[PDB]
A and B are shown apart, each in its own frame.
Chain A
């Protein structure tokens, strides 16, 4: 029954966060974040909206999707890179 959609207001913030994550990834010499991750973030936000039968995605859905994907991306890295990432990414992995 449920087929959610995005809201066009906060997507500017998502683009800024995507660019920031890419800049930080390059700055520490990590393998870069990609468009596949951004697509996955939007898809997971849709799934979170579907879970409560909401036809709208919301800011908290995007926040939770961002946390899931960012944490998953962090877990793949080497230990020194992992520490730099979590120190910088604190405003996404824990805060928003």
Chain B
């Protein structure tokens, strides 16, 4: 199994192109990165028009030779970490799936399955129905629902990538001394980041990019997104992490910091999520809260 985004569905080319690790290793947000991918497939001996075919229909010979082709070629691109072992399951004649693909299907179903207090209640009630839309997909009798989950997973990753490139190309990351700050004031559709899990997927994209872009300055990061209906920013505090191939674990300290500023502050804020690293605050109060936060020694 390969750390490639949904290999056995869509195509081999899309598997590399949307992989969260490959983007950090080859810088796919710009053309000098994309050309490296074209160059790789040309050297590997795979015709580029076949690499884009649906992986079920891709030719049998390439399918069986792929396991050796990677051993000869990933080293030249510094990309050897793609290779690993994992668990695969199959039932009758309906074809294989790995656990890594299964969990992406389930998370996608959680995210996208189908004055202020009432709207918040409606939203939080909608998110609970998706629990049962995911629960009913753990049954082999209901593979039909699992396929829908996979179709949603692909669109979610597409929309995430199309926001990440905008953040990096417009250089919206602000490099403060103690931590890195990023705030989304507008977007193609900013509603997708109103759910916590989607926001964390975007954060995990940016964290891989920041982890590989320079050897220096492993820093905490703060990410926020506005909502036009509440006029509140949804804020999340994220740790750094060490690369895949490299020894105690680090700890997320934003919890105590957000709690202390919340205990002190004039600001209109909410803390009720299980994960205390995520908070919410009104439009005008973001800047004084972040000012008091950076003035604090708790970061």
Chain A directly contacts chain B within the complex, with at least one CB pair under 8 Å: no
Chain B interface residues toward A at CB < 8 A: none
Chain A interface residues toward B at CB < 8 A: none
